[PDB]
């Protein structure tokens, strides 16, 4: 069974621009897929629809057992605990330590504090930065910040991780390091969809490629080339 099932999705913004014009995409647990296409094709709109940051107008969309047409605002946090999200600009909170930035994504459950700490240390070890637990984001390189943000994204052990240009603000060396981390997370079973403009990454680390142009899927292929 699918972990993401999108059918005939249409999205028109308030000013009238139709950003998705009938997109259908099916993703199985454990897949790694790149989302590629020219500026304005609708990649960001597609990614945002997967964690309900944008609401679809027509079609259907299910993610991790959540019906994103039906889900109420009050339940989006629950969805966010099954879908981790990674951003091009990392979006750490600059006044919080590394520990606080990661712990913030874990829901408080009565006590929870000691359990939260063990899990924060687990994901820090997964990304190789346990020695930064008390650091602030400014003390970290861009690559280190994105590794911390990825630790935050997986802190609830989600089955899906969505990334919008996760290496777009990183230089080449750090871009490859972040790809290695994402691939390691994927090999453990997590489904990963990531939008990207990095032709060298897509052409080298071959995965499923979903190409969008003018709001429609034009190509969907195993181990595909970047094609742009
Ligand atoms: N015409 C547009 N084309 C592309 N992106 C847009 C457009 N209008 C708004 N945006 C996006 O939305 C952001 C601003 O959101 P906006 O609709 O102005 O809401 P608000 O001002 O209430 O926060 C922009 O930074 C951009 O990312
Ligand atoms: N908030 C917005 N309001 C109006 N138009 C928008 C908004 N955000 C994006 N668009 C437009 O919708 C289309 C798709 O944008 P986007 O999903 O960001 O594409 P991509 O990520 O492929 O560059 C573009 O024409 C863009 O200008």
Numbering used by the authors: 1 to 228
What does the paper say about this structure?
FtsEX is a membrane complex widely conserved across diverse bacterial genera and involved in critical processes such as recruitment of division proteins and in spatial and temporal regulation of muralytic activity during cell division or sporulation. The component FtsX is an integral membrane protein, whereas FtsE is an ATPase and is required for the transmission of a conformational signal from the cytosol through the membrane to regulate the activity of cell wall hydrolases in the periplasm. Here, we provide the first three-dimensional (3D) structure of FtsE from the notorious pathogen S. pneumoniae, and we show that it presents all the conserved structural motifs of the NBD members of the ABC transporter family. The nucleotide-binding site is located in lobe I near the interface between the two lobes and presents the nucleotide sandwiched between the Walker A and B motifs.
Two different crystal forms in complex with ADP were obtained in the same crystallization conditions belonging to two different space groups, P 1 and P 21. P 1 crystals contain one molecule per asymmetric unit and diffract up to 1.36 Å resolution, while P 21 crystals contain three molecules per asymmetric unit and diffract up to 1.57 Å resolution. In both P 1 and P 21, the resulting structures correspond to monomeric FtsE and provided excellent electron density for all 230 amino acid residues of the protein. Structural comparison of the four independent FtsE structures reported here (one monomer from the P 1 crystal form and three others, M1, M2, and M3, from the P 21 crystal form associated with chain IDs A, B, and C, respectively) reveals significant differences among them. The fourth region (R4, residues 101 to 115) affects the C-terminal part of α3, which is even partially unfolded in monomer 1, resulting in a longer coil loop that protrudes from the monomer structure. Morphing between the two most structurally different FtsE monomers (monomer from P 1 and monomer 1 from P 21) illustrates the kind of movements observed between lobes I and II of FtsE. The distance and the angle between the two lobes fluctuate up to ∼4 Å and 9° (considering N157 as the hinge between the two lobes), respectively, revealing an unexpected intramolecular breathing motion within the FtsE monomer. In addition, two extra ADP molecules were also found in the P 21 crystal form. They increase crystal contacts but are not located in sites with physiological relevance in other ATPases.
